[PDB]
């Protein structure tokens, strides 16, 4: 039904939301991995 | 279809589960960001 397809569209949009969120988190996490390695190299 | 109602409920719940997990990981990443900033200030 139109109603069911509205929900399915919402679910697919939500998955795109979550995917984009984790992609952006991966970019930030790459920057933090680099930062801690740079600081560890300076000390240890 | 109504046969898929239980699957659909579980799909929506699984999105809740994944959202909550990503939110929690985001807050831990924010902590990691500031931990590296303070370490950089102290080291450099």
């Amino acid at each position: 039904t139109v109603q069911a397809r509205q929900l399915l569209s919402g679910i697919v949009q939500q998955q795109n939301n979550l995917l984009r969120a984790i992609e952006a988190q991966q970019h930030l996490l790459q920057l933090t991995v680099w930062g801690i390695k740079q600081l560890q190299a300076r000390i240890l | 279809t109504v046969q898929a109602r239980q699957l659909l409920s579980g799909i929506v719940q699984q999105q809740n589960n994944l959202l909550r997990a990503i939110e929690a990981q985001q807050h831990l990443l924010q902590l990691t960001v500031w931990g590296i900033k303070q370490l950089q200030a102290r080291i450099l």
């Binding site: 939500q14 939301n17 984009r20 988190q25 | 659909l8 929506v12 999105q15």
Partner: peptide, 26 residues
Amino acid sequence: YTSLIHSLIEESQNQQEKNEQELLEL
């Protein structure tokens, strides 16, 4: 990146409430 992530999570949170409401309404 932090602002990009926060905006996506905020949108995801609203979509989750909407999806849960629409599911209940079926």
